[PDB]
């Protein structure tokens, strides 16, 4: 698998627009 | 010695797709039969012998509106699929060849090598092909490559064959499953602070069709020609020998040659042959056929409406699978007109 850090920030509003 | 000032009036009406002009009748190579491994576990592992047979496919003539044509061709591999495969055991997740227009690497993130959003952005970019290992397409005789928006860089050398090993450099990335990522993000953050998140690619879709992701990797066994062209080695990819171009429904505009045989004296290096084919040409023009550019933002929205009105899913037999779904309509296209 892949383990990202604690504060990895994907820049897509993800939860809700 | 008499000379004539020839003037010609021409008016034609050609269907966009027809047997003549080779706008129809393309040829491909797909899975025909998948044998079962005798004495081995069936559902636990499905690796076994596979067969591939070249086939030539046909389209009903007169189906204009290239959004339809890219769809109609897909419909045909599914026809063949149906017959041959169903009867012989090929999976429905292994159609092999499919024509799409999405940019499967749009939401890709370099750190995770996964498509973050979870859906491939349904915005059309350019027609392309998606090929499983061991399958390929041909366009040597049929002129659908011009409609497909694919033109060979060095045209004269013969044969426009596309193969899976040829599209080396671009593989469709897998999709991150939204719930698992959100669960880990919420759980780990809340628990650790008050008192390492993991990312998993999607193994398969809802209907059970398998995305057949490469084990140990975030890729899949689907090589998109568009991805290879842009996101790939310029020498080891299709960038070396294949050129991107704007799709046109007209499928090019060949020249017509006007010959009057018994009126005008033959030109310099023509001899009087009464063959049906060969006559001494007198003039050359492009066909009255021409393509007019048309544009509308709500192409995708209009496509959904047509699904309800048509009241049938013959063109969308796989709504569940994202990479096998109906390709999006293009925002800017062409419509053939006769002048």
């Amino acid at each position: 698998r892949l383990r990202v850090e604690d504060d990895f920030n994907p820049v897509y509003p993800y939860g809700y627009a | 010695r008499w000379g004539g000032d020839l003037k010609t009036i021409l008016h034609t009406n050609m269907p966009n797709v027809n047997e003549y002009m080779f706008t129809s009748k393309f040829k491909a190579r797909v899975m025909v039969s998948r044998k079962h491994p005798e004495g081995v576990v069936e559902t636990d592992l499905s690796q076994d012998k596979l067969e591939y047979e070249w086939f030539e496919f046909t389209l009903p003539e007169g189906n204009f509106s290239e959004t339809m044509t890219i769809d109609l061709m897909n419909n045909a591999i599914l026809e063949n699929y149906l017959q041959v495969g169903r009867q012989n055991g090929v999976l429905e997740s292994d159609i092999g060849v499919k024509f799409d227009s999405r940019n499967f690497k749009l939401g890709w993130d370099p750190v995770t090598k996964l498509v973050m959003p979870g859906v491939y952005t349904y915005e059309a970019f350019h027609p392309d092909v998606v090929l499983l290992p061991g399958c390929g397409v041909d366009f040597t005789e049929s002129r659908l490559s011009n409609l497909l928006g694919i033109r060979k860089k060095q045209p004269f050398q013969e044969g426009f064959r596309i193969m899976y090993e040829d599209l080396e450099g671009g593989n469709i990335p897998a999709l991150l499953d939204v719930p698992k990522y959100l669960e880990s993000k919420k759980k780990v953050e809340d628990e650790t602070k008050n008192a390492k998140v993991e990312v998993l690619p999607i193994e398969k879709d809802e209907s059970g069709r398998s995305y057949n992701l490469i084990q140990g990797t975030h890729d899949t066994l689907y090589r998109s020609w568009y991805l290879s062209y842009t996101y790939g080695d310029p020498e080891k990819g299709v960038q070396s020998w294949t050129l991107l171009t704007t799709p046109d429904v007209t499928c090019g505009a060949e020249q017509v040659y006007w010959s009057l045989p018994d009126l005008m004296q033959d030109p310099v290096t023509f001899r009087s042959t009464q063959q049906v084919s060969n006559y001494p040409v007198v003039g050359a023009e492009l066909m009255p056929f021409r393509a007019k550019s048309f544009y509308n933002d709500l192409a995708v929205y209009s496509q959904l409406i047509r699904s309800y009105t048509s009241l049938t899913h013959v063109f969308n037999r796989f709504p569940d699978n994202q990479i096998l779904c109906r390709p999006p309509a293009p925002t800017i296209t062409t419509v053939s007109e006769n002048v």
């Binding site: - | 033959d266 001899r271 009087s272």
Partner: protein
């Protein structure tokens, strides 16, 4: 009888010979030269100056 099951009454059939019909080419072969048809006529032109 309406049928041919080889029945009693069917034993009475009578037959006549097929009507003679000869087939052959026309006199002097007048069918196969496309004379005086402007759609496709012969040519006896010089090889150089056609």
């Amino acid at each position: 009888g309406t049928s041919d099951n080889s029945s009693e009454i069917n034993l009475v059939q009578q037959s006549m010979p097929n009507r003679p019909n000869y087939i052959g080419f026309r006199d002097n072969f007048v069918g196969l030269m496309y004379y005086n048809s402007t759609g496709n006529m012969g040519v006896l032109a010089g090889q150089a100056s056609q």
